[PDB]
Ligand binder design. Structure first.
Ligand SMILES: CC(C)(C)NC(=O)[C@@H]1C[C@@H]2CCCC[C@@H]2CN1C[C@@H](O)[C@H](Cc1ccccc1)NC(=O)[C@H](CC(N)=O)NC(=O)c1ccc2ccccc2n1
Ligand SMILES: [Cl-]
Ligand SMILES: [Cl-]
Ligand code: NA
Lengths: 99, 103
């Protein structure tokens, strides 16, 4: 529960009944997962980053387990090359940046 | 929430940096391998490189051993310069300033 940043801060998450690897990403506003199905309603969204924008599906009130911590929040699903846990869920597991 | 900007990540972890004598705002970014800054002049030689983010790849200029102050902490390391929408401090420099992620 202290993470060095000598390497990418990857953790195991559980989402939609599936285990995935994801990056703990303080530079991301949003949580973005590679294509998968999630239950309930969704709406389209455009999100941007270094290269431009991608279109994703926004699912609200999704439960996720991050390095064994349960949280709930919005999850975006779409063609990201890496699963990223952004600040909307990092706050829910109590993550902090310290220096 | 808690202070800089902030620790608990309820707001973007933005800080002031100083590079080539100029102050800029930048984001502390554990998800970024590299540090990427908007167009500016830096000394010395550079080499080109393509870096990828969420949307695709951009071309940037790699400058090595650049002096940069990050929220008052001195670092000397590699800076990539190019059309990034936000100035990014990545793990190459977060480790120099002793940043850690805790949960
Ligand atoms: C900076 C660089 C070295 C290229 N690294 C990266 O970009 C890696 C690439 C990885 C593979 C692709 C999937 C994401 C990961 C993590 N990212 C870091 C990652 O932290 C990246 C850094 C960043 C921040 C702001 C603007 C641009 C880029 N964040 C993001 O990609 C998130 C995605 C999101 N919507 O949550 N972007 C934002 O949170 C965000 C915020 C403000 C913005 C203003 C204008 C335009 C775009 C903006 N995007
Ligand atoms: Cl949320
Ligand atoms: Cl470096
Ligand atoms: Na929902």
């Amino acid at each position: 529960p202290q993470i060095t940043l000598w390497k990418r801060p990857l953790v195991t998450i559980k989402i939609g009944g599936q285990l995935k690897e994801a990056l703990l990403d303080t530079g991301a506003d949003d949580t973005v997962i590679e294509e998968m199905s999630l239950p309930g309603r969704w709406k389209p969204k455009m999100i941007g980053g270094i290269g431009g924008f991608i279109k994703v599906r926004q699912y609200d009130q999704i439960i996720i387990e991050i390095a064994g911590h349960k949280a709930i929040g919005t999850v975006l699903v779409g063609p990201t090359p890496v699963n990223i846990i952004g600040r909307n869920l990092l706050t829910q597991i109590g993550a902090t940046l310290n220096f």
